[PDB]
Amino acid sequence: GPLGSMESYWDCKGIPILFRTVHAAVELAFTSQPGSISGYPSICRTTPLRTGPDERRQFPLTDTGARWQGGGITYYVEATRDKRHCEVFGTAGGVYKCTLVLR
């Protein structure tokens, strides 16, 4: 394939979740009605902000770059529409925040 250096990614217990994957998942989350993609996206309303509503959606991610196809959930993103908030989590062993590795 084409030569490329590593892009920014989230390290989820050793598995890299690429920025392009996360971006695509947020785009799908915000172009899909809540719950419609096999239960997702869901709405995170648990962090009211001093600046008012800023709708945050939760949506599954995959390690493959393929869009999630409705099955198990090992990784997920919580983000606003323009990704100004964007965090990635895993579920293995209990929910944990993945580590952003900037490249």
SS (H, E, C) the chain: CCCCCCCCEEEECCEEEEHHHHHHHHHHHHCCCCCCECCECEEECCCCCCCCCCCEEEEEECCCCCCCCCCCCCEEEEECCCCCCEEEEECCCCCEECEEECC
CB-based contact 59:41 (threshold 8 Å):
yes
Rounded Cα distance, 77 and 90, in Å: 9
Half-sphere exposure of 18 (CA within 13 A, CB side): 12
Q: Structural domain tally of the chain? A: 1
- Structure solved using which method? X-ray
Resolution in A: 1.1
Report long-range pairs for 77-82 (Cβ below 8 Å, ≥24 apart).
77/22, 77/25, 77/26, 77/29, 78/44, 79/22, 79/26, 79/29, 80/54, 80/55, 80/56, 81/26, 81/30, 81/55, 81/57
CB-based contact 4:98 (threshold 8 Å):
no
In the block, tokens 């600046």 appear at: 51
Domain around 23: 1-103
